[PDB]
Every structure is written in structure tokens, then in C-alpha cells.
Amino acid sequence: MLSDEDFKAVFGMTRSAFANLPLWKQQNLKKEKGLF
């Protein structure tokens, strides 16, 4: 699970807020980042 710090250097905002974009935008920004 992307711990706060890790998330930081991954998406930009927070994973909680990260789940506010469109679901297709989610899986995308994900495999695009936060997947590692």
C-alpha cells in the first residue's frame, strides 16, 4: 500500500482524494503510477 510518503512521490495529492477522479482516470493514473 502506498504509504503517505511514497504516495507523495507518486500521484501528487492523497490516495483518498486520488479516488475522486473518474474510475478510468483511476486505473490509469494507477498503472501510470502508484503501482510500484
UniProtKB/Swiss-Prot annotation:
Positions the record marks as coiled coil are none
User: What is the recorded post-translational modification?
Assistant: Phosphorylated on tyrosine residues. The unphosphorylated form increases the initial rate of actin-nucleating activity, whereas the tyrosine-phosphorylated form inhibits actin-nucleating activity, enhances actin-bundling activity and enhances actin-severing activity by reducing high Ca(2+) requirements. The tyrosine-phosphorylated form does not regulate actin-capping activity.
Domain of life per record = Eukaryota
Question: What residue spans carry the region label Absolutely required for activity?
Answer: 30-33
Q: Where can this protein be found?
A: Cytoplasm, Cytoskeleton; Cell projection, Microvillus; Cell projection, Lamellipodium; Cell projection, Ruffle
Could you tell me in which tissues this protein is expressed? Specifically expressed in epithelial cells. Component of brush border microvilli.
Binding partners and assembly: Monomer. Homodimer. Associates with F-actin; the association with F-actin is inhibited by tropomyosin.
Note what the entry says on domains: Consists of a large core fragment in the N-terminal portion and a small headpiece (HP) in the C-terminal portion. The core fragment is necessary for both actin-nucleating and -severing activities, whereas the HP binds F-actin strongly in both the presence and absence of calcium and is necessary in actin-bundling activity. The Gelsolin-like 1 repeat is necessary for the actin-capping activity. The entire core fragment is necessary for the actin-severing activity.
Q: Which family does it belong to?
A: Belongs to the villin/gelsolin family.
**Annotated function:** Epithelial cell-specific Ca(2+)-regulated actin-modifying protein that modulates the reorganization of microvillar actin filaments. Plays a role in the actin nucleation, actin filament bundle assembly, actin filament capping and severing. Binds phosphatidylinositol 4,5-bisphosphate (PIP2) and lysophosphatidic acid (LPA); binds LPA with higher affinity than PIP2. Binding to LPA increases its phosphorylation by SRC and inhibits all actin-modifying activities. Binding to PIP2 inhibits actin-capping and -severing activities but enhances actin-bundling activity.
Instruction: Please report the name of this protein according to its UniProt entry.
Output: Villin-1
Q: Which organism is it from?
A: Gallus gallus (Chicken)
Q: Quick one: which gene encodes this?
A: VIL1
